[PDB]
Amino acid sequence: ALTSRTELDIDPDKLRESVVELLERHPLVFEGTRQLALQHRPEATDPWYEGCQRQSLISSDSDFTEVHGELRDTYLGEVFDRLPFKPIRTRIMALDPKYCYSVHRALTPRYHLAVTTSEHARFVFIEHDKVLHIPADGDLYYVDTRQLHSAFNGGDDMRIHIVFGTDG
Amino acid sequence: ALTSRTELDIDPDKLRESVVELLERHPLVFEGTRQLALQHRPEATDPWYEGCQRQSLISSDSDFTEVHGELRDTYLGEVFDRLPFKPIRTRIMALDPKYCYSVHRALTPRYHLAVTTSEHARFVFIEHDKVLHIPADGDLYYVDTRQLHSAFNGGDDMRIHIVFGTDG
Numbered sequence A, B: 001a002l003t004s005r006t007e008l009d010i011d012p013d014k015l016r017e018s019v020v021e022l023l024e025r026h027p028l029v030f031e032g033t034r035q036l037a038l039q040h041r042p043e044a045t046d047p048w049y050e051g052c053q054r055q056s057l058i059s060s061d062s063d064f065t066e067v068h069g070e071l072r073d074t075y076l077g078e079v080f081d082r083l084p085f086k087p088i089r090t091r092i093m094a095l096d097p098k099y100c101y102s103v104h105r106a107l108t109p110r111y112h113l114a115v116t117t118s119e120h121a122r123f124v125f126i127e128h129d130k131v132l133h134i135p136a137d138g139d140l141y142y143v144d145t146r147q148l149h150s151a152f153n154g155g156d157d158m159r160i161h162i163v164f165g166t167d168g
Ligand SMILES: [Fe+3]
Pocket: A077, A078, A081
């Protein structure tokens, strides 16, 4: 299916406060889609940003396995503890205000946990002709972004998701 | 329904080059949605832009009845001649690359003639759960933007529409 929900029973409000606090120490990079890597390659020199990527040439996710160490004392660490799968290349993926990206097919589905969002942030599946909202309800949403799609944020606030990759 | 198409048999390439030459003598204003008024109130002193003002400044479209004189001997004036209705407050309305607007209900539904567009430009109707594309095929698309909707342009180029009002 396009999307499925899995209850993590995470507190959206404590999760937000934890993310907002982390970005004050480790700010998002890029524009349009702003990013922070939450997993890094073993023994990485640039653990907070190496995993961040948006150029046309996508590289493999398999090496970004280490949840950063300073997360285990934060509520954001609790999200990783509750995951029912082993995540790879986890990133904060924040859509800027009034921003959307190209209609395209992604390489791989991802799980999205919306941290901050609004009714103006949607996924748009072109062939399925469905519009999908991911609420900041503390639960995990599988989104099949291999389907022809775009995402937009028509609001004036950043739409912040945590986006988890998986092998299996 | 959300949309309807009336055959106009405008030539897309001629309309496009007509619009490009107009715009380099009368530039678009604003960011995000960039605009130019093609109709003005009688005796308007700022006829190319008064019709572009935001809603809180405009009681209704009905006063903007006059097609600019310099349009009559161009291909654009031919477009006005072929419409099956009396147009009011017609504007060029260009959506910026990678831009979208909030999910809202528009005051007034309008007729769209796409000038330049791409597969990355769509209307999104939230309640109807439908995604619409308006092709640059020389025909006129009524779009009921009173419905809860957004629009987005995920391409690298501006999505240029001519947007016609009507009083019926
Ligand atoms: Fe824990």
